[PDB]
Amino acid sequence: MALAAPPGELTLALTPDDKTLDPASLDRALAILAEHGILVLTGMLRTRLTDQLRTAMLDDLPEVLRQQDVPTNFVPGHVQQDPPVRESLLFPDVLLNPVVYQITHAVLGADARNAVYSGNMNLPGSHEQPVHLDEPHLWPGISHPPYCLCVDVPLIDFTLENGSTEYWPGSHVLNPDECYDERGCVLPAELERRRAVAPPVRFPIPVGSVVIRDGRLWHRGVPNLSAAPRPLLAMTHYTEWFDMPPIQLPDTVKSWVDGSDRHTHAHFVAGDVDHLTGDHPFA
């Protein structure tokens, strides 16, 4: 709560040149994800990539807001927006990042696969989301290991002002009976018990960072009190055995996406994919 940079205990500092973590860096990464459920990797992505993705998503926001019903996460101002899947905006260092997949391989296995290429546009004057998990526990009242890791790419500097996400460290292992409602929101009794032992944190995250977290981590989107939309690009790695629909990608990227040992659950389509309406033929 009210930090000035990502906490040391959650953070691993890299450069965009780093292709693998040395054994001790990986051990620390996995120790952080196991204990805290969230890992911040600073210095992962070049300005060249984040700038293009930021531009592409801010250019698409008008088409998203024109929709009959604008799909929002829980409350007003938290808009669901898929980034483009044009050949020229699909970057191996984003989709198939070698450090990300080194971590996800070590936690979920070599057959783990990305099955989400989506985004969260947090609008100026947005409301507070309820504390929730994005992915549920597979059975109520059971402790089990992760089956999915969210990979979140901020496309501007996230600040306390513009809606940097509230995270509940270590919350990813909590699954008592009657803890979650049908939408994945944490029952208030469990929130206040948890707050006494391990209160939530919120911190700036500079663009170029990648956040990897347990899909079961408690978090909430919070108001964007800045004058500008706060874009996030979102991917999710799942174990091979978890049923997900495939990502629609153009067959122009099949050559490097298919037959990588960094797996994507993908359906390849002739021609352009409509990333926003999703309505294209042969989908």
Could you list the residues that contact Ni ion (CB under 5 A)? 134
**Smallest distance from Ni ion to CB 151, Å:** 14
Number of H helices, E strands in the chain: 6, 12
Identify the DSSP state of 178.
T
Closer CB to Ni ion, 17 or 182, in the complex: 182
Closer CB to Ni ion, 213 or 262, in the complex: 213
Closer CB to Ni ion, 18 or 128, in the complex: 128
Closer CB to Ni ion, 146 or 273, in the complex: 146
Question: What long-range pairs does 199-202 form, CB within 8 A, spacing at least 24?
Answer: 199/1, 200/1, 200/131, 200/166, 200/167, 200/168, 200/169, 201/1, 201/3, 201/7, 201/166, 201/167, 201/169, 202/1, 202/2, 202/3, 202/160, 202/164, 202/165, 202/166, 202/167
CB 146 within 8 A of CB 108: yes
> Tokens 């947090």 sit at which residue?
122
**Smallest distance from Ni ion to CB 120, Å:** 8
**Smallest distance from Ni ion to CB 88, Å:** 29
Reduced to 3 states, what is the DSSP secondary structure of residue 63?
helix
**Smallest distance from Ni ion to CB 84, Å:** 22
**Smallest distance from Ni ion to CB 221, Å:** 6
Give residue number: closest CB to Ni ion: 134
Closer CB to Ni ion, 134 or 214, in the complex: 134
What separation in angstroms does the CA of 256 have from each of 102, 116, 143, 153? Answer: 18, 18, 37, 21
Closer CB to Ni ion, 134 or 166, in the complex: 134
Closer CB to Ni ion, 72 or 175, in the complex: 72
Torsion on CA atoms 273, 274, 278, 279, rounded to nearest 10:
-100
Gap between the Cα atoms of 257 and 99, Å rounded: 16
The distance from CA 54 to its chain's CA centroid, rounded to whole angstroms, is 15
**Smallest distance from Ni ion to CB 160, Å:** 18
**Smallest distance from Ni ion to CB 131, Å:** 9
Closer CB to Ni ion, 66 or 183, in the complex: 183
Report the b/e string of 200-234 with b at 16+ CB within 10 A.
Answer: bbbbbbbbbbbbbbbbbbbbbbbbbeeeebbbbbb
**Smallest distance from Ni ion to CB 123, Å:** 16
